[PDB]
RNA sequence: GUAACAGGCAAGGUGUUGUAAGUGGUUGAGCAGCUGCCAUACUGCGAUCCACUGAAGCUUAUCCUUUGCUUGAUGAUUCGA
RNA sequence: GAACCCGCAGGUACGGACCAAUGGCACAAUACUUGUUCGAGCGAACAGUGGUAUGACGCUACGUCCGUUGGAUUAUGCCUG
RNA sequence: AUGUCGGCUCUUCCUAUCAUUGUGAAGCAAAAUUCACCAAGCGUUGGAUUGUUCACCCAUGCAAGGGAACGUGAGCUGGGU
RNA sequence: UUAGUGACGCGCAUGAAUGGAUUAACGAGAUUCCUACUGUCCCUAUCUACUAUCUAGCGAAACCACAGCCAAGGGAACGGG
RNA sequence: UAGUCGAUAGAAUAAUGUAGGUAAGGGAAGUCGGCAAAUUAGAUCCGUAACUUCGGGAUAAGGAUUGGCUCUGAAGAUUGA
RNA sequence: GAACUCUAGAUAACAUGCAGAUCGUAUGGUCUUGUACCGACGACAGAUCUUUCAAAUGUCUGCCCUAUCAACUUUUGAUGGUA
RNA sequence: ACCGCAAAAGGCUCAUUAUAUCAGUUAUGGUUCCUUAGAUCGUUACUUGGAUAACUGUGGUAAUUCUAGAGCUAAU
C-alpha cells in the first residue's frame, strides 16, 4: 500500500492532516489570539506586583 | 502517487483527489476539487477569488517562508599559476615586494639607455659614410 | 544517478554513480545553487557540502537556471543567455529545456563541492588537474602579482619551456606583453594630439 | 447505577459559503456648494476597493469530540416447571 | 491455419451489494441578484422552494466492489466376457 | 357482455437445440460450416419503415433458434381495426 | 425509410363550378426532413408541497347464492366447492 | 386600505400518486406521433430569404446588448436685463 | 510660394553622443637620456556637413472586356476641418 | 574563435494584380542614407579594470545542432 486518503468525508476533503492545513492556511485569527491573551494576563500580573 | 498543485487555488492535490482537465492545445489544468472546477468553468478571475493562494500572494496575506530566501553572494575562488613556471616559481615572482620590483625596473631601463644612444649614434656615424 | 562532482579548488573533476534511491533522493526538490549535506549521500563524503552547479537529464535538454518546473518547458531565447549562444545576429530559437530542480529523470548532476569534509576522496583531492595559464597582459599580471604602476612586469611574465618533442632543441615562449606602455603606442598618442592642434 | 451515565448546550475539531456588521481611509471615474490680505481647499454625496477579516454566518438533526455548563435519575401491566 | 484446453488478463450480459472518490439531487444552508416591503441600515420577510452560483449530514448514478465446489451419471468412449 | 390487434411492460415453461457445455456423423486435412444426441442451465439483441405480429432492411456479436398460457386495456397506449 | 417528396401515370374505381388546376396571406388542422432543445429515452435518481399512512373527531358506497388454497381429470368440451 | 385566515386537525411526512422542479454524458435512439417537457421570449440596435395577390413573408433567418453608480449632452415654460 | 527650425547663430533653459586607453608601416630630432618631450602616412572608428550608391512617397497623362453590372463610398475613415 | 562587413540581393518567376504596378513627366520647404570622395573636434590612471569565446578538460539528447558545467586568456 502506498497512500491512504485521510481527508474529511464531511464532505469535500481538501487536506489530509491538521498539520497540512496549517501549511496552506496562513495566520488565521485563532491560535495566535490565545497567545496574545496570555501576554496581556502577564502584563496585568506584573502591574499588580509593582 | 505524486502530490500536485491546483493550478488555480494553489492547494495540494493528494492522490486521486479530483480532476485534471487537459485542453486541446494542450495546457494541463489541475483541480483539487469541484469548487475550483466549477468557479473557473464559470470563468472567475482567480485574482478576484480570495480562495486562491495566487490572490493571497498578490494581496500580501501570509507568505513568510518564501520571502526569507534572497540576498548575498560575492565569490573569489583562486590564483591560476600551474603551467607557465611550475607553481613555486610563479609564487616567487608574485611575492617579491615593490622595493625590489622598482630595482628590476630601473636596472633594465639603465641597460636600455646605452642601446638607444648606441643605435642613434651608430646611424649618425653611418650617415657620413655615403 | 551519475554525479559529475568537481573539486574545482584543485581544478579537478571525477565521475561517480549513485545506485541507491535514498542517497539519490536527497537531491530531489533542490534547486540550482542550493546547499546539500553529503553525509546522507555517502560515507566517503562525510562533511562534504554540495552546491548544485548544473545538470543534464535523460531526455537531455540541458538544465537552465530558474525555469522551475521539474519537467521540461519550451522557451524562446536570446543573446547571450544560458542555453543561448547564437551563431547569427538577432537569431532567436525555441528549444525544449529542462529546468533547474533535481528529479528522477536526471542522468547527470553537475556538482561543485563547497567544503572538504573529513575524508580525502583521491581523484578530487590528491591529484591537481591544473590551474591552466599565467596572465600574459601587463594589466592582468598587475593585479595577480599586485604590481601597481611603479613595479613593471618584463621578466615576471610566465616563461614556459616546451619541447616540440621529436626532433627538437627545447625552446621557451615569452609571450607577448600587450599594452606594456610600449613607446610606439606612446608616440601615436603624441601624434593624435599633434593633428588636433595643428588643424 | 451521581456515571462505562444519559441528554440539551456552549466550547474545540470537521464541513459549507466566500471575506459580516461597525469603523477608518478621497481607495474611488467624478460631482455639487463657499471662497480669503496669501498659499488654497474643505465640507458633504460616490458603485466599488482595502484594513480590521481566510472573515461573519451556517455545522447534521441521520457529524466527531468533551475532567466545560446545566439538567434527568421519582409512570403501567403481566408471567410460573 | 486451430487466439485451441494448461496458464494469464480484461471485458460482456445478468444478478447482489456499497456512496470513499467521481457524477447526480437540494439544506429553501451560505453567498449574490431582481421586484417589493421593514423610514434608511443591519438582518430578514413576501414572489406558495423567487431567480442565480456554490453547495454539506444524507440519498443515489453513469461510479466501484463481489458472484463457490464436488458427486450421481446422460449422451458417449471403454474393460472383462 | 368472457374487455379486438400490435407495440410498450412483465411471467413461466416447452423443445422439434441456432449459440454455449459434454458428445457421436461428415465426400471435416487446417480453418470453417453442416448433421445428429444428452440438454431449455444460459443467450437469442440495437435501430430505419410499417399500427403491424408477420415482413424488409441496416449495424454488431462465435450465435441475433422456434413454440405454448388468440397472455397481459380497474396496466398503458387507443395507432390499425 | 411498408414513411415522405419529385417523377412515370391503360389512371382497379382521377378530372373540369357534379368544379379542375395553381396559390401569397391565414389555421389550438393532416403530413414529412433537418437543427436548437430537453429525463421523450439510454437508465435511472432526487427534491418541494399536499396526500396516501397513523391517530382524536366524523363517516358512506360498489358488491355480496354460499363464498373463497392449488394441480390434473371428468363435466355445458377452462373448477373456490 | 377594506375583507380573510373557515376550506376537520395533529404526528409521521413510506410506497404509489397529484401538483411543481432538477439531472452528468449522449441528445428522440423514445413513441402512433416530439405527446409531455425543455429551448425561445421583453427592449434597443444590426441584419434579414424563398415566395408574393407587392400589401406581406417579418419578431423571417442570423447576430450584438441590457445591472449598479457617477458624470455629460439633448429635449420645454416665463418674464427679466 | 516664405515668419523654413534651410547651412549657421545669440539670449533663457535642456540631455549626452562626440573628442581613439587603435593598429600596421617606418623611425627622426634633441638629451638633464625620466626610457622624456614631439612627429609623417592610411586602415578601422568618430562627430558635423556635403557628395555619391541609393530610396519611400507625391504630380501630370495613358491601359482589355463587360450595363444580362447604374448608382456607388460612409458596419469600424467614406470624403473634409482641427488637434 | 571574437570583432567588423556582406548575405536586404544576384538569380527566379509574373501569381495576386486594371490607375494598382509602370513608362514618360516630375517633386521632396515631406524625408532617410552605411558607404566612398572631400573637409571638421585645444572648454586627475595615460595607456587602466575584469569576463568570456577560441583553448584546455568534462558532459548531455537517437540525432542535425542546440549547448550545460568547470578552469584560462585578447580587443578597433
UniProtKB/Swiss-Prot annotation, chain A:
Subcellular location, record wording: Cytoplasm
The domain of life for this entry's organism is Eukaryota
Q: Which residues form a coiled coil?
A: none
**Cystine residue pairs:** none
This chain's function reads: The L3 protein is a component of the large subunit of cytoplasmic ribosomes.
Tell me the protein family, please.
Answer: Belongs to the universal ribosomal protein uL3 family.
Name used for this protein in its record: Large ribosomal subunit protein uL3
Species this protein is from = Drosophila melanogaster
Encoding gene per record: RpL3
Portion of the full sequence shown: 365 to 414 of 416
Curated annotation (Swiss-Prot), chain B:
Q: Which keywords, in A-to-Z order, does the entry hold?
A: Ribonucleoprotein, Ribosomal protein
Superkingdom field: Eukaryota
Q: Which GO terms describe its molecular function?
A: mRNA binding; structural constituent of ribosome
Which stretches does UniProt call biased (Low complexity)?
Answer: 124-130
- Give the record's GO biological process terms: cytoplasmic translation
GO CC list: cytosolic large ribosomal subunit; cytosolic ribosome
What family does the database annotate?
Answer: Belongs to the eukaryotic ribosomal protein eL24 family.
Q: State the protein's name.
A: Large ribosomal subunit protein eL24
Source organism per UniProt: Drosophila melanogaster
Cite the source lineage: Eukaryota, Metazoa, Ecdysozoa, Arthropoda, Hexapoda
Question: Entire protein: which part is shown?
Answer: 1 to 130 of 155
Curated annotation (Swiss-Prot), chain C:
> What is the annotated localization of this protein?
Cytoplasm; Nucleus, Nucleolus
Lineage, broadest ranks: Eukaryota, Metazoa, Ecdysozoa, Arthropoda, Hexapoda
Q: How does it assemble?
A: Component of the small ribosomal subunit. Part of the small subunit (SSU) processome, composed of more than 70 proteins and the RNA chaperone small nucleolar RNA (snoRNA) U3.
Q: Which UniProt keywords apply?
A: Cytoplasm, Nucleus, Phosphoprotein, Ribonucleoprotein, Ribosomal protein
State the species of origin. Drosophila melanogaster
- A single GO CC term, please? cytosolic ribosome
Give the function comment from the record. Component of the 40S small ribosomal subunit. Plays an important role in controlling cell growth and proliferation through the selective translation of particular classes of mRNA. Part of the small subunit (SSU) processome, first precursor of the small eukaryotic ribosomal subunit.
Asked if the Swiss-Prot or TrEMBL record annotates the protein with the keyword Ribosomal protein, the reply is: yes
How is the protein altered post-translationally, as described in the entry?
Answer: Ribosomal protein S6 is the major substrate of protein kinases in eukaryote ribosomes. The phosphorylation is stimulated by growth factors, tumor promoting agents, and mitogens. It is dephosphorylated at growth arrest.
Span covered, complete protein: 1 to 199 of 248
Q: Which family does it belong to?
A: Belongs to the eukaryotic ribosomal protein eS6 family.
Biological process (GO) annotations held by this record are: cytoplasmic translation; ribosomal small subunit biogenesis
* Listed name of the protein: Small ribosomal subunit protein eS6
Q: Which residue pairs form cystines in this protein?
A: none
Q: What GO molecular function terms would the record report?
A: structural constituent of ribosome
Amino acid at each position: 500500500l502506498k497512500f491512504i486518503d485521510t481527508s474529511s468525508k464531511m464532505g469535500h476533503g481538501r487536506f489530509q492532516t491538521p498539520a497540512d492545513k496549517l501549511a496552506f492556511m496562513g495566520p488565521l485569527k485563532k491560535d495566535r489570539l490565545k497567545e496574545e491573551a496570555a501576554a496581556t494576563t502577564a502584563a496585568a500580573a506584573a502591574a499588580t506586583t509593582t | 502517487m505524486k502530490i500536485g498543485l491546483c493550478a488555480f487555488s494553489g492547494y495540494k492535490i493528494y492522490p486521486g483527489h479530483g480532476k485534471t482537465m487537459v485542453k486541446i492545445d494542450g495546457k494541463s489544468f489541475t483541480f483539487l476539487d469541484k469548487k475550483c472546477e466549477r468557479s473557473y468553468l464559470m470563468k472567475r478571475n482567480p485574482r478576484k477569488v480570495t480562495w486562491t493562494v495566487l490572490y493571497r500572494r498578490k494581496h500580501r496575506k501570509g507568505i513568510e517562508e518564501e520571502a526569507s530566501k534572497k540576498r548575498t553572494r560575492r565569490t573569489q575562488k583562486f590564483q591560476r599559476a600551474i603551467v607557465g613556471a611550475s607553481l613555486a616559481e610563479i609564487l616567487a615572482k608574485r611575492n617579491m615586494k615593490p622595493e625590489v620590483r622598482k630595482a628590476q625596473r630601473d636596472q633594465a631601463i639603465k641597460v636600455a639607455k646605452e642601446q638607444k644612444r648606441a643605435v642613434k649614434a651608430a646611424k649618425k656615424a653611418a650617415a657620413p659614410a655615403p | 544517478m551519475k554525479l559529475n562532482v568537481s573539486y574545482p579548488a584543485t581544478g579537478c573533476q571525477k565521475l561517480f554513480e549513485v545506485v541507491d534511491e535514498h542517497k539519490l533522493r536527497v537531491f530531489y526538490e533542490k534547486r540550482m545553487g542550493q546547499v546539500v549535506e553529503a553525509d546522507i549521500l555517502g560515507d566517503e563524503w562525510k562533511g562534504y557540502q554540495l552546491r548544485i552547479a548544473g545538470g543534464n537529464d535523460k531526455q537531455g535538454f540541458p538544465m537552465k537556471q530558474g525555469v522551475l518546473t521539474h519537467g521540461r518547458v519550451r522557451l524562446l531565447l536570446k543573446k547571450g543567455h544560458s542555453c543561448y549562444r547564437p551563431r547569427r545576429t538577432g537569431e532567436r530559437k525555441r528549444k525544449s529545456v529542462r529546468g533547474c530542480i533535481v528529479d528522477a529523470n536526471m542522468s547527470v548532476l553537475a556538482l561543485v563541492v563547497l567544503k572538504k569534509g573529513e575524508k580525502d576522496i583521491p581523484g578530487l583531492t590528491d591529484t591537481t588537474i591544473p590551474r591552466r595559464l599565467g596572465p600574459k597582459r601587463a594589466s592582468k599580471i598587475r593585479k595577480l602579482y599586485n604590481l601597481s604602476k611603479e613595479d613593471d612586469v618584463r621578466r615576471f611574465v610566465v616563461r614556459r619551456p616546451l619541447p616540440a618533442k621529436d626532433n627538437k632543441k627545447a625552446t621557451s615562449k615569452a609571450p607577448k606583453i600587450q599594452r606594456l606602455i610600449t613607446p610606439v603606442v606612446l608616440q601615436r598618442k603624441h601624434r593624435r594630439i599633434a593633428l588636433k592642434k595643428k588643424r
